[PDB]
């Protein structure tokens, strides 16, 4: 269906112990494909997926220069923001940036993004219309006036509608064997007695791709969403994901509960119960 | 494929 491409960037100042640490990562949907770390032995933009490895040396050199340029812009911006916020040069501060595009099943732009945060809070964001900005405070307003003066939004919208969309298409085509293959969850139900009066029923979903999934518990076919403990989806470490959903049930009533699994890799939704 | 332009300081 829909797919996405995102670039993430984090810069962290470290006063009295060198210059800022810069880390950037690139994703196609839930697949990491490129990375750059300012603390690497000799910093280079590196591949992290097999379908990106066939890009030429010109590609690797350009991506490396862009990350180095972003790290440098962030170092300067960290100093500017100390002035905007009347902050001390002694403290550690964070600048984060995310940008990217979403494409429909046809390969046409659905949504574009460009957002910045300072110390974990929204700083400035490109609006959903890709032509105007939203500044979070009076300091971000200084940035907005600069970016409006340079006509940044027009050039960024041109990237989001153009190269972002086209390269995402090329990556999707080159990595179709993996990016466009949905791996269904391996599913099971565990039973954990608490006391002679109650037990936990835990519904597991393992080794799935992409991360998006719906796990619900039902009682006599009626939704138990309010009563369900859902853990945060977690990476297995091999590009696939794991998740569980649990309910606390009266002992001897376990048979009234069904777990329901919805995932792209499943041709039809799954219904499971505790064995037996 | 990353984006870049000159003059993006905050």
């Amino acid at each position: 269906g829909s797919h996405s491409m995102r670039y993430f960037h984090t810069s962290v100042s470290r006063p009295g112990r060198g210059e800022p640490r810069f880390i950037t990562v690139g994703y196609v949907d839930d697949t990491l494909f490129v990375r750059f770390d300012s603390d690497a032995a000799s910093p280079r933009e590196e591949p992290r997926a097999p379908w990106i490895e066939q890009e030429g040396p010109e590609y690797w050199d350009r991506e490396t220069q862009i990350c180095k340029a972003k790290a440098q812009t962030d170092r300067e911006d960290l100093r500017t923001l100390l002035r905007y916020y009347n902050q001390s040069e002694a403290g550690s501060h964070t600048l984060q940036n995310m940008y990217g595009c979403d494409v429909g099943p046809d390969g046409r732009l659905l949504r574009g993004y460009h957002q910045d945060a300072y110390d974990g809070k929204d700083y400035i964001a490109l609006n959903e219309d890709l032509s105007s900005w939203t500044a979070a405070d009076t300091a971000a307003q200084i940035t907005q006036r600069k970016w409006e003066a340079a006509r940044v939004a027009e050039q960024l919208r041109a990237y989001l509608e153009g190269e972002c969309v086209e390269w995402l298409r090329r990556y999707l085509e080159n990595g179709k064997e993996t990016l466009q293959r949905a791996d269904p969850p391996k599913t099971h139900v565990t039973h954990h007695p608490i006391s002679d009066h109650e037990a936990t029923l835990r519904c597991w979903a393992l080794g799935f791709y992409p991360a998006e999934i719906t796990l619900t518990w039902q009682r006599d076919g009626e939704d138990q969403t309010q009563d369900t403990e859902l853990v945060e989806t977690r990476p297995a470490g091999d590009r696939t994901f794991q998740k569980w959903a649990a309910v606390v049930v009266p002992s001897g009533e376990e048979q009234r509960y069904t777990c329901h699994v919805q995932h792209e890799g499943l041709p039809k939704p799954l219904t499971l119960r505790w064995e037996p | 494929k990353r984006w870049i332009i000159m003059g993006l300081n905050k």
Partner: T-cell receptor
Amino acid sequence: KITQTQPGMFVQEKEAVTLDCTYDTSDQSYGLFWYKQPSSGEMIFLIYQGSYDEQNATEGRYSLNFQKARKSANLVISASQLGDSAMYFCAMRDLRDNFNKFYFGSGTKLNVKP
Amino acid sequence: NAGVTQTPKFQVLKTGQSMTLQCAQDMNHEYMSWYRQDPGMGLRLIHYSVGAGITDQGEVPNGYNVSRSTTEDFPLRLLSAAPSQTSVYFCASREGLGGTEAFFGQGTRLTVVE
């Protein structure tokens, strides 16, 4: 590498003048700049054009005819004035060294004739 | 406001003498640099600073030294004047390494005499 083929150009006062510039880069990301240097020797920033900017930069009487395919960044000065007689430098920075160094052309001496 | 204030505008020096070329910028610019302009050699980078406490060498750093104690100032020191140092020196500042507000100082016309 910046090429200003013309060490000199003349124009009749009130007429427009084009100063040629060609640039050589293997980068997709770069910026083109023009500077004016009057006889007093100061170096005055006139105009800038980014390689990803779709519209031709304009700043008062200055227009930069950016022709990306032709690798040219000619400066057009409209309604020439006596004060326009000076040296004009075409310059560029590019992604290769993170836009650090300015690469300047040899310059063109504009002589505005009354 | 005033932008980049580069002093002195003119200087005559005896060979072996020292001198500090002064450069202040009131624009909160993170980037500052020194260039020298010579016939045929064009504009060459001497030294540059990407921020307070950081300085790096340019194309022609020998016989020159710099310091970046504060964001505002970027002095150029000539420890021992040589006739080859006869040139026009320019202090150029900008908002950052990839910045486009590319402004230059008034220039320093240096004559080193024996």
